[PDB]
Amino acid sequence: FLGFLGAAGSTMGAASMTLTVQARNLLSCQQHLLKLTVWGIKQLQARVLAVERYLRDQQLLGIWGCSGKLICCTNVPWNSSWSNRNLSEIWDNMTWLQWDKEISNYTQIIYGLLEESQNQQEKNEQDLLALD
Amino acid sequence: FLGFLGAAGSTMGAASMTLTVQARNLLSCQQHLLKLTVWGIKQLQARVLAVERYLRDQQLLGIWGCSGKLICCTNVPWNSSWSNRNLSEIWDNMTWLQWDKEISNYTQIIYGLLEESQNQQEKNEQDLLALD
Amino acid sequence: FLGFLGAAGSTMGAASMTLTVQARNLLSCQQHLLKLTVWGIKQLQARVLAVERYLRDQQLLGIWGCSGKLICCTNVPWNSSWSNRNLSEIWDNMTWLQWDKEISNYTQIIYGLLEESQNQQEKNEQDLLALD
Amino acid sequence: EVQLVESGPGLVRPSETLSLTCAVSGDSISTNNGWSWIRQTPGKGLEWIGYINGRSGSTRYNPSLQSRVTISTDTSGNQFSLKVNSVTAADTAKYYCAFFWSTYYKRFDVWGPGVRVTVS
Amino acid sequence: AENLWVTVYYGVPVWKDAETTLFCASDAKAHNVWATHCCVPTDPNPQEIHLENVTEEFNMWKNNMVEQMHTDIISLWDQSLKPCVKLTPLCVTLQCTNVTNNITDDMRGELKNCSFNMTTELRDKKQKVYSLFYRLDVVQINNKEYRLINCNTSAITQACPKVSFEPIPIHYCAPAGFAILKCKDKKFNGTGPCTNVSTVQCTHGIKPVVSTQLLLNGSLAEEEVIIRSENITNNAKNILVQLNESVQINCTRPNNNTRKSIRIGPGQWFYATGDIIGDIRQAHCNVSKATWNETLGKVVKQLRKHFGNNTIIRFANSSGGDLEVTTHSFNCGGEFFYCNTSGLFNSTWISITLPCRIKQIINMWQRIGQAMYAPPIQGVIRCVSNITGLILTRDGGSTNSTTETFRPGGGDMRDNWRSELYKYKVVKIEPLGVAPTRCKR
Ligand SMILES: *[C@@H]1O[C@H](CO)[C@@H](O[C@@H]2O[C@H](CO)[C@@H](O[C@@H]3O[C@H](CO[C@H]4O[C@H](CO)[C@@H](O)[C@H](O)[C@@H]4O)[C@@H](O)[C@H](O[C@H]4O[C@H](CO)[C@@H](O)[C@H](O)[C@@H]4O[C@H]4O[C@H](CO)[C@@H](O)[C@H](O)[C@@H]4O)[C@@H]3O)[C@H](O)[C@H]2NC(C)=O)[C@H](O)[C@H]1NC(C)=O
Ligand SMILES: *[C@@H]1O[C@H](CO[C@@H]2O[C@@H](C)[C@@H](O)[C@@H](O)[C@@H]2O)[C@@H](O[C@@H]2O[C@H](CO)[C@@H](O)[C@H](O)[C@H]2NC(C)=O)[C@H](O)[C@H]1NC(C)=O
Ligand SMILES: *[C@@H]1O[C@H](CO[C@@H]2O[C@@H](C)[C@@H](O)[C@@H](O)[C@@H]2O)[C@@H](O[C@@H]2O[C@H](CO)[C@@H](O)[C@H](O)[C@H]2NC(C)=O)[C@H](O)[C@H]1NC(C)=O
Ligand SMILES: *[C@@H]1O[C@H](CO[C@@H]2O[C@@H](C)[C@@H](O)[C@@H](O)[C@@H]2O)[C@@H](O[C@@H]2O[C@H](CO)[C@@H](O)[C@H](O)[C@H]2NC(C)=O)[C@H](O)[C@H]1NC(C)=O
Ligand SMILES: *[C@@H]1O[C@H](CO)[C@@H](O[C@@H]2O[C@H](CO)[C@@H](O)[C@H](O)[C@H]2NC(C)=O)[C@H](O)[C@H]1NC(C)=O
Ligand SMILES: *[C@@H]1O[C@H](CO)[C@@H](O[C@@H]2O[C@H](CO)[C@@H](O)[C@H](O)[C@H]2NC(C)=O)[C@H](O)[C@H]1NC(C)=O
Ligand SMILES: *[C@@H]1O[C@H](CO)[C@@H](O[C@@H]2O[C@H](CO)[C@@H](O)[C@H](O)[C@H]2NC(C)=O)[C@H](O)[C@H]1NC(C)=O
Ligand SMILES: *[C@@H]1O[C@H](CO)[C@@H](O[C@@H]2O[C@H](CO)[C@@H](O)[C@H](O)[C@H]2NC(C)=O)[C@H](O)[C@H]1NC(C)=O
Ligand SMILES: *[C@@H]1O[C@H](CO)[C@@H](O[C@@H]2O[C@H](CO)[C@@H](O)[C@H](O)[C@H]2NC(C)=O)[C@H](O)[C@H]1NC(C)=O
Ligand SMILES: *[C@@H]1O[C@H](CO)[C@@H](O[C@@H]2O[C@H](CO)[C@@H](O)[C@H](O)[C@H]2NC(C)=O)[C@H](O)[C@H]1NC(C)=O
Ligand SMILES: *[C@@H]1O[C@H](CO)[C@@H](O[C@@H]2O[C@H](CO)[C@@H](O)[C@H](O)[C@H]2NC(C)=O)[C@H](O)[C@H]1NC(C)=O
Ligand SMILES: *[C@@H]1O[C@H](CO)[C@@H](O[C@@H]2O[C@H](CO)[C@@H](O)[C@H](O)[C@H]2NC(C)=O)[C@H](O)[C@H]1NC(C)=O
Ligand SMILES: *[C@@H]1O[C@H](CO)[C@@H](O[C@@H]2O[C@H](CO)[C@@H](O)[C@H](O)[C@H]2NC(C)=O)[C@H](O)[C@H]1NC(C)=O
Ligand SMILES: *[C@@H]1O[C@H](CO)[C@@H](O[C@@H]2O[C@H](CO)[C@@H](O)[C@H](O)[C@H]2NC(C)=O)[C@H](O)[C@H]1NC(C)=O
Ligand SMILES: *[C@@H]1O[C@H](CO)[C@@H](O)[C@H](O)[C@H]1NC(C)=O
Ligand SMILES: *[C@@H]1O[C@H](CO)[C@@H](O)[C@H](O)[C@H]1NC(C)=O
Ligand SMILES: *[C@@H]1O[C@H](CO)[C@@H](O)[C@H](O)[C@H]1NC(C)=O
Ligand SMILES: *[C@@H]1O[C@H](CO)[C@@H](O)[C@H](O)[C@H]1NC(C)=O
Ligand SMILES: *[C@@H]1O[C@H](CO)[C@@H](O)[C@H](O)[C@H]1NC(C)=O
Ligand SMILES: *[C@@H]1O[C@H](CO)[C@@H](O)[C@H](O)[C@H]1NC(C)=O
Ligand SMILES: *[C@@H]1O[C@H](CO)[C@@H](O)[C@H](O)[C@H]1NC(C)=O
Ligand SMILES: *[C@@H]1O[C@H](CO)[C@@H](O)[C@H](O)[C@H]1NC(C)=O
Ligand SMILES: *[C@@H]1O[C@H](CO)[C@@H](O)[C@H](O)[C@H]1NC(C)=O
Ligand SMILES: *[C@@H]1O[C@H](CO)[C@@H](O)[C@H](O)[C@H]1NC(C)=O
Ligand SMILES: *[C@@H]1O[C@H](CO)[C@@H](O)[C@H](O)[C@H]1NC(C)=O
Ligand SMILES: *[C@@H]1O[C@H](CO)[C@@H](O)[C@H](O)[C@H]1NC(C)=O
């Protein structure tokens, strides 16, 4: 908790340097909870949900071939229709909150393409003469 | 949910192309649950179990050296006694349900060997002149 | 459960050969639990905690760049002030329990350095002429 | 079952290029990988020249021939060919068209009769 | 000499039979108990998947989905009554008369006018009140002194006059890691393999309707009358008959009632049955004769199929026992009717008015120890329902092929769910597996 959100106003490029700050903070009595068994449930539900959300994101990175990475490259080309901007307009002079608002509607298109790309890559690994 | 089980009647080879379809579907009120605290537990138990089953499979892939992969190679030889068939009898003209019935009794033998193989591989990585 | 703690009296070097024995054992009615809804909670709390502890360790290995490994190298130099001993005094003639007592106070210093090292490594991967 | 049929000049003069065409019957070049050329050099034996992926146009060549060899595919004709930049007497060999299938599940060859080419 | 190396696959389409807990889901659109315990909506367009080339074995008699409905239904009944007024103070000696004003002879002796001494909201004060009772719930002490029928056996509580128990179609859905498989094949026996199957997220909507002898408001077969049983040969087993044509049944309660509210304690009200307005008549059900005496003919041809080609089939009346066993227990409008079905099973193969009784203190089949008092309904009621199937019991098995006798049977609450959960099975998905390939690290 030394920047949980310190990069929020930074540009997209600059904010790429705090990815471990946000990730490490996303998976952070005695008798009362059992004597009054309403609160034991209220507390467990909050804990179970934090775990399920964490795992769903990890499963996607696994499927897309980005497991274990905070920054990962793929082979899906960027469609100009998703955002008609060049790199100097995206990485500089723009925040991640603004970018998310701009892309939002295309999130599922992009995710579907990332999954298709990884499956094609695996198919090419079961053919010993691949990519030649 | 576009094929949760669509490949069930396909051959083992053909079914290898839907591994992301099955994996992505294996880790998918308000007041009622706290007013009637029987159901809060019934629901949490179902959710906790889904998480524990997921994690046990991930731990095994980790131990065997197959983390992050849907298709993974190992160095354990296949024993002819486990199934005396050639590749043209296994990958074609056979389903995964049939294969599982055929192998079942040998599941633990195979898993034990996969763990031994990875440990031997690690030992060879702490000797800078390894495999020469 | 064939050595859950068999290596406890072994030297640090010898004990490095049982890492899969300890790891595989760290993430191991009917009506009673719902009829008496004190025990349903007592049991779920124990299960949720085992999962949360497992995941926190996995997240750290991820952040440090050691995901999927039982033995992992880093680029952080050892400070002689953390333990002024040579390798022949550490790997031989010393147990892991003794070593942990010796290092304890420096645990957080070391962990902080491991995170900084991985971030520097990632920065160098977004510059195509890196390390030359 | 794939059949491989080859033709081209059996005589090339020194400093002239060499050109051989392999016709493919029974399957589509554009669908499979592993279309390749191998030659049998007298006094040496069999040597790999290179291969092409009919699905992409990507190729790989034996380093000793990277400065001279071109492999390409005619997707209309369903034939592929080998071209070699200027050749010498040292290139006299029996040249062959072959198809190599090598995957996790199957291994097989289709190997045609070849063309004898003399450089002189 | 194959020289292959155990490769590992994850996400393999392999499944095994399993028992888990299913969750309920609804249409959203639906003070009804099942509108509250079935909050999660289903998808409006369920993702059903046909499985090509899959053969799977089913067994409706060993299906644990049935057992879960039994537990869920009785569990909800025992939660809905939790906050409501106990009627313990009414278990007092009653003074009763015969209610002889404006009575049809068929109702003579059916109602009693009972007065009694009960408390008011104050500890030191009493009131004299009276109400009407049905004779089924009033028992003579040692000719005017009467006791409530269950005072020497069980506690009594008042059904909450707010909560509806009208059936709502509900759907059962699998938890993550599980799937439900369905048979779409034809004329399924209820057991054995089916070769036309699909994977679903949830079951179709099932209404938790509970009745005896006749099965109401279910799925109406499809192509023909189908007769199913665990054994058929064993006369200790039931036979479930599912019809492909419904039979309409019209039930009514002709007496125009009113209600009175009696204070039973501070903040606690008791709802008593008041005077009947107009003539007193007997409750009854109407079955069209023109449909019933044909529906059975269809059943008989199919029933003969399992016993012989030239044998006589006889439909006899029910046997002895409690009203819950010997009569058609019918829950409608909020009141409990016990109807006489002898008029439907009185023939040999080779408008029908059924009288009904009404009971208010219900010792539900589910258990012994507590009973529910059902408050009366104001005005009059009418019910319209579909007979979709019958539960028959074979009362023979004797050494005489000449003829066989069938009687109305059943009575188990599960007989009303088994016929809908009939097409479904629960399986667990197991994603790891290994196989040899010609590839090593
Ligand atoms: C097999 O399937 C069939 C078909 O679904 C099913 O039959 C249906 O049963 C339900 C329940 O018994 C019937 O629904 C009732 O219908 C009456 C008819 O009223 C009509 O006329 C009034 C006049 O103003 C209209 O307003 C009304 O819309 C109708 O046109 C309704 O009156 C019932 O509603 C009352 O009772 C409900 C119980 O919870 C209350 O929630 C509701 O608010 C109403 O109560 C109010 O008025 C009362 C009047 O005295 C008052 O006392 C209450 O305090 C409150 O103010 C209800 O809608 C439905 O019509 C049946 N369908 C047919 C064709 O008959 C079978 O039962 C089923 N078989 C089974 C399960 O065995
Ligand atoms: C870039 O994407 C367009 C299609 O995007 C459209 O808008 C999206 C929000 C979503 O609604 C999509 O479904 C839309 O189609 C691609 O153009 C499509 O290409 C296919 C190819 O056959 C064609 O059938 C579609 O009609 C095209 N759509 C339109 C509107 O013409 C385009 O090719 C993509 N470019 C790249 C480089 O991927
Ligand atoms: C293939 O496996 C056999 C042993 O498998 C047997 O059957 C299994 C179901 C299980 O019961 C095993 O425990 C059985 O042993 C290997 O043969 C064994 O080799 C060891 C080597 O010393 C020998 O001591 C055993 O007696 C042998 N077993 C028998 C029955 O003779 C065989 O070597 C394995 N082959 C490969 C390539 O791994
Ligand atoms: C090894 O570590 C020392 C510092 O460790 C000290 O003791 C620890 C328990 C903890 O209290 C630390 O905060 C302490 O500082 C390093 O020496 C420091 O180097 C910085 C560099 O500018 C200097 O400002 C500090 O004053 C130094 N500390 C002292 C006590 O002089 C030393 O450089 C480290 N060596 C290596 C190789 O990393
Ligand atoms: C908030 O905005 C200001 C400017 O709008 C940012 O300041 C700039 O920081 C860059 C960093 O190198 C400097 O080169 C610019 O000259 C600064 N601008 C001005 C006007 O001084 C500031 O950094 C922003 N805050 C965050 C968190 O990004
Ligand atoms: C992303 O979705 C939003 C809505 O969720 C789109 O904004 C709407 O666009 C329609 C188009 O006729 C307008 O009528 C709405 O008023 C807009 N809503 C708002 C809040 O402005 C938005 O255009 C979509 N973006 C893209 C790129 O398709
Ligand atoms: C179900 O079985 C049939 C045959 O028993 C499969 O059909 C075969 O599909 C392959 C695919 O290339 C064809 O080459 C064969 O000629 C087909 N056979 C026939 C008789 O047409 C069908 O695909 C199977 N279904 C699944 C899901 O695998
Ligand atoms: C795998 O285990 C099954 C049992 O779980 C084995 O089948 C049994 O084998 C014994 C051997 O005498 C028979 O008596 C049983 O009747 C068999 N059971 C069934 C259901 O057929 C099966 O043979 C084992 N497979 C292997 C390869 O060992
Ligand atoms: C417990 O301590 C004894 C000695 O203190 C260990 O025995 C030694 O084991 C090494 C292994 O190669 C031998 O080379 C030594 O000669 C042994 N010493 C003696 C005196 O025999 C013993 O292994 C220790 N136990 C554990 C679990 O490490
Ligand atoms: C690690 O921490 C322990 C305490 O948690 C340190 O031991 C204490 O050191 C102080 C120093 O004045 C003594 O007064 C205490 O009595 C010591 N405690 C014990 C239990 O002995 C220990 O020295 C620290 N180690 C390092 C390397 O700093
Ligand atoms: C049930 O008994 C009560 C009396 O215990 C009857 O109520 C009385 O009816 C007469 C008729 O004129 C009235 O004058 C009295 O004032 C009524 N008494 C009370 C206390 O209301 C009641 O009518 C009887 N009900 C039936 C159906 O016979
Ligand atoms: C499995 O059963 C389904 C029944 O729902 C069959 O689907 C029908 O097939 C006929 C064929 O002409 C169509 O006309 C119907 O419209 C289909 N029904 C539906 C609901 O779409 C299906 O063909 C059967 N499959 C097998 C293998 O017999
Ligand atoms: C129905 O249940 C009866 C009773 O168990 C079965 O008939 C008996 O089967 C046993 C099997 O060993 C025989 O020994 C008995 O002699 C049989 N009884 C008679 C009267 O023959 C009967 O087979 C079952 N039928 C079905 C269709 O399940
Ligand atoms: C259902 O109704 C029938 C007739 O409507 C009742 O049958 C009568 O039972 C008595 C008992 O001995 C006989 O003496 C009568 O002759 C029977 N009538 C007929 C027409 O057979 C039957 O008891 C009623 N069932 C119940 C449960 O009340
Ligand atoms: C009272 O009810 C009983 C019920 O059997 C009946 O026999 C008796 O004749 C009734 N008394 C009067 C006055 O009708
Ligand atoms: C109420 O109590 C009085 C006390 O004497 C008794 O006479 C009267 O009959 C009781 N009333 C009833 C209906 O039992
Ligand atoms: C209650 O009394 C009635 C009177 O006939 C009797 O039949 C019944 O068995 C009794 N119940 C118990 C539990 O004793
Ligand atoms: C009774 O059967 C008819 C036949 O079509 C059907 O339309 C009606 O909805 C059914 N009623 C019930 C309650 O299912
Ligand atoms: C019901 O099944 C009988 C069986 O012969 C058939 O004749 C009749 O037409 C079927 N009814 C319907 C509605 O299909
Ligand atoms: C249907 O069930 C009966 C009762 O056990 C059985 O004898 C018969 O063989 C079954 N039919 C099929 C097709 O399984
Ligand atoms: C049953 O039919 C009789 C015939 O007269 C009729 O009077 C009665 O009202 C009908 N009952 C119902 C419930 O329709
Ligand atoms: C039930 O009532 C409806 C009301 O219109 C009537 O049409 C139908 O024929 C009645 N059914 C019977 C069995 O009398
Ligand atoms: C019984 O009658 C049916 C009518 O078609 C016939 O097909 C069947 O063979 C007959 N069975 C015997 C045993 O005669
Ligand atoms: C059975 O049918 C006969 C036919 O006349 C009739 O007399 C008898 O009363 C009927 N039985 C019942 C219980 O309705
Ligand atoms: C009425 O039932 C008898 C029973 O044997 C049957 O013979 C008669 O044909 C039935 N009536 C009609 C209209 O089918
Ligand atoms: C019961 O009788 C009252 C008397 O006026 C009438 O208003 C009411 O509508 C009747 N209720 C019925 C027949 O449901």
Numbering used by the authors:
A (entry chain E), B (entry chain B), C (entry chain F): 519 to 546, 561 to 664
D (entry chain H): 1 to 35, 35A, 36 to 52, 52A, 53 to 82, 82A, 82B, 82C, ...
E (entry chain A): 31 to 60, 66 to 141, 150 to 185, 188 to 309, 312 to 323, 323A, 324 to 396, 413 to 503
Provide passages from the article that reported this PDB entry.
The sole target for neutralizing antibodies on the virus surface is the envelope (Env) protein, a homotrimer consisting of three copies of gp120 and gp41 subunits that are associated by non-covalent interactions.
Antigen-binding fragments (FAbs) of RM19R bind to the BG505 SOSIP trimer with an affinity of 0.55 nM, as determined by biolayer interferometry (BLI). Thus, immunization with BG505 SOSIP trimer antigens in the presence of the trimer base-specific antibody RM19R greatly increased antigen accumulation in follicles.
